[PDB]
Design a protein around this ligand. Structure first.
Ligand code: HEM
Ligand code: HEM
Ligand SMILES: C[C@H](O)[C@H](O)[C@H]1CNc2nc(N)[nH]c(=O)c2N1
Ligand SMILES: C[C@H](O)[C@H](O)[C@H]1CNc2nc(N)[nH]c(=O)c2N1
Ligand SMILES: CNCCCc1cc(C)cc(N)n1
Ligand SMILES: CNCCCc1cc(C)cc(N)n1
Ligand SMILES: [Cl-]
Ligand SMILES: [Cl-]
Ligand SMILES: [Gd]
Ligand SMILES: [Gd]
Ligand SMILES: [Gd]
Ligand SMILES: [Zn+2]
Lengths: 400, 402
């Protein structure tokens, strides 16, 4: 049972939960790969395990109703080759995957999640309206609310429900007469697919991409989003009057539409989850990463900083002010957003919660520590154990 | 063989070097323990030494030669006769450079070949040990133009206890448990400070009192030695545009000299082999001064900056820490004392990884230690995947001798 220390306070815990880890991770006694991003009837083992989880949680181990539900899934797989999840189970499992996500720093919220069950979905113009309910629900005029919509569980012999975009809101990226990119370069490829499938490209740098939505075996179909449903925030700085002129914006709803929810051995390749943003996500990664918007040197010129020597820390000053603008902009617009201090402190709280409840917590240190000011947040000084619990969110190959 | 991607650029390389990982670390396929700070007969001494000698002869382009098999048999015949063996001087110099090269948590490894090696394996007493240490500090400090150096004291051997430097670094500031329940000085150093007093040191009571050395000779209690003040070069901390900053009274010392780690070379063990380089600004400005469990000046600076410390979203912590780092860089540059910032350091470490891939087919690296503790993703190492593993020769942790 791994010994885990917090170096700010000196306290020690033991991760007894780590013993359950199923899908073995990427590391070996020989080498550590913790820093790498992307490192028939077995279906009943994973469903038995999940159902046993559900009842224990509602204090219902070893009972009539516990006995009972094990048999129906036994018979369901026997006849048809899979099974259907009871409504409450799909809800319980959606929350558990979130609770189990090692790279999510906001899991103190894991118990408050709105589950839209789209399992009876049947087409692309159908898909679009489920997605469109979710978005408008979760956005809620800026008072953001966590939601996951769950589309049909994949089956053999038939195609797949998949969202071809990484997120529900994504900006375009276009090459040029010199190869380089206007717009967001994280989405250069999916932009090229959309322009291919009929979409008329804009000139702008913040063109909200049309959803490529795909129903089983039928090809994708472009689905222009209602611009009044895409809540956005123009970026301004509280005291740097010129920051607004830079013309920067980001969207309100972070909604991940390419991961594959897995409950009880069942795989839902379309299950968009959404919450709200941590400011460093926008202001540090999205805007300042060299391979993303790469605005850092432009804000430093406008601040009349000395970009000629790295020891002026001009990169660090400009970055802090870009983050201030994000928090200021979002707060002015009344869109739910949380700073990396408030958020990491709440995750520390979560770890103590999960300590008493489940005896530990899988956390990925490299993803919990924020990309600025890491050692100024408490999680920096917290040792962490990383492992895989089910149910979970998993990565999946792109549908091409 | 692990595929390793650079997310900033799109580069892809495979780490074949990891295949030869000598010892084992704490992770398994069940679970990663990478973020843990402390993750821990003649025949096996033989195959270790055999491996190092094979290394040494490869570096001098003599692999498979007369001299190469001569040394092998020499070493075997000596472990047979004595249960151990002695390194040649040139083997020792190569061994200490490799250990630097192999150290997964050092971001400064671009320099690994520029290392001055003081052979002190003839040392006899704590007193001779003290003299060797002062000569080390003197040469490395070099009046502010710092030089990388290591001093190697006698190896562990059957029949005799170890040499040990009880201090974790050659220059450390006292930490006195206080009136309330607080610490005056550096709270990382209360234990060693208690030990020095318990061994006859007359305590000071400032915040930056330099500690005496406790030097341990084989089968002897530690002996207290005071460092001559004129030999510990310090830097008063001032801010280039914030003139009230000098009234904080903060200082730091020039020479980072780690003194409690163990140098391992072809199976031989050197529990006393202190080494020194020059500081990266974040060690002082972020960690040593802003850590809540260290000098913890972050809120005091922020108030002085007239930042609004009542809400986190104003990013007062971020802004105050950036200025503390600025002050460190400026103070060391004003005082003409070598220093590298996390941007310069991480960029040069990226060249090191490129040198190492061509030379050895990879590089062992502890991501969470290489990425700076401020402005992480602003530096290029954040966006670089890394493989962490243990190669020998090596610097290892060892327990406190008390
Ligand atoms: C409500 C507030 C939430 C906040 C502030 C938050 C914050 C974050 C952040 C900062 C990341 C790192 C992502 C990156 O840097 O690429 C992350 C990852 C993740 N989050 Fe959350 N999250 C929230 C809610 C949720 C919800 C509702 C779910 C699912 C139902 C979720 C599941 C995940 C997963 C699976 C990842 C891993 C993403 C990946 O591997 O690319 N989180 N979260
Ligand atoms: C010349 C300039 C050098 C720079 C800028 C540098 C940089 C660094 C930094 C910033 C750390 C992390 C320290 C911490 O966060 O506690 C580190 C760790 C380390 N360095 Fe270097 N270094 C230098 C020279 C050297 C030399 C000369 C050696 C040995 C011969 C060495 C061996 C090590 C070791 C063993 C560690 C890990 C120590 C530990 O695990 O506590 N470095 N280095
Ligand atoms: C190479 C490195 O593992 C990679 O850049 C990771 C590090 N930590 C991260 N953490 C978060 N939250 N998001 C990321 O994209 C990354 N990138
Ligand atoms: C628990 C966590 O691993 C610990 O705080 C580490 C993180 N990374 C670090 N990185 C460096 N360079 N030095 C440190 O002391 C630490 N501490
Ligand atoms: C590249 N990351 C995509 C968006 C990540 C994310 C997802 C969620 C659900 C919340 C959040 N705060 N952040
Ligand atoms: C806990 N380590 C404290 C000193 C670390 C260190 C050591 C060396 C040799 C150089 C450096 N720049 N930093
Ligand atoms: Cl994003
Ligand atoms: Cl230090
Ligand atoms: Gd101007
Ligand atoms: Gd001033
Ligand atoms: Gd004061
Ligand atoms: Zn690992």
């Amino acid at each position: 049972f791994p010994r885990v220390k917090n170096w700010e306070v000196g306290s020690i815990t033991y991760d007894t939960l780590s013993a359950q880890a199923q899908q073995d991770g990427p590391c070996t006694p020989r080498r550590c790969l913790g820093s790498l991003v992307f490192p028939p009837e077995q279906l009943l083992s994973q469903a038995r395990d999940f159902i046993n989880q559900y009842y224990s949680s509602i204090k219902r181990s070893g009972s009539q109703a516990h006995e009972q539900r094990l048999q129906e899934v036994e018979a369901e797989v026997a006849a048809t080759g899979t099974y259907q999840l009871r409504e409450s189970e799909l809800v319980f499992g959606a929350k558990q995957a979130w609770r189990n996500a090692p790279r999510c720093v906001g899991r103190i919220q894991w118990g408050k999640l709105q589950v839209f069950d789209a399992r009876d979905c049947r087409s692309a113009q159908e898909m679009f309206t489920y997605i469109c309910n979710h978005i408008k629900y979760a956005t809620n005029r800026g008072n953001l609310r966590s939601a996951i919509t769950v589309f049909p569980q994949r089956c053999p012999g038939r195609g797949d429900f998949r969202i071809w975009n990484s997120q529900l809101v994504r900006y375009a990226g276009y090459r040029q007469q010199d190869g380089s990119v206007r717009g967001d370069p994280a989405n250069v490829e999916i932009t090229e697919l959309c322009i291919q499938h009929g979409w008329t490209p804009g000139n702008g740098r913040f063109d909200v991409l049309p959803l490529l939505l795909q129903a089983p075996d039928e090809p994708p179909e472009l689905f222009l989003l209602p611009p009044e449903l895409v809540l956005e925030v123009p970026l301004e700085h509280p005291t740097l009057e010129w920051f607004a002129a830079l013309g920067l914006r980001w969207y309100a709803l972070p909604a991940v539409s390419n991961m594959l929810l897995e409950i009880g051995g069942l795989e839902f390749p379309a299950a968009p989850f959404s919450g709200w943003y941590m400011s460093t996500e926008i202001g540090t990664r999205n805007l300042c990463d060299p391979h993303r918007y790469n605005i850092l040197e432009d804000v430093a010129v406008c601040m009349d900083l000395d970009t000629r020597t790295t020891s002026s820390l001009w990169k660090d000053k400009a970055a802090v002010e870009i983050n201030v603008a994000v928090l200021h902009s979002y707060q002015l617009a009344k869109v739910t957003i949380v700073d990396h201090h408030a958020a990491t402190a709440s995750f520390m709280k979560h770890l103590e919660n999960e300590q008493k409840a489940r005896g530990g917590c899988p956390a990925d240190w490299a993803w919990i520590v924020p990309p600025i000011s890491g050692s100024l947040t408490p999680v920096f000084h917290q040792e962490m154990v990383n492992y895989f619990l089910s149910p979970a969110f998993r990565y999946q190959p792109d549908p091409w």
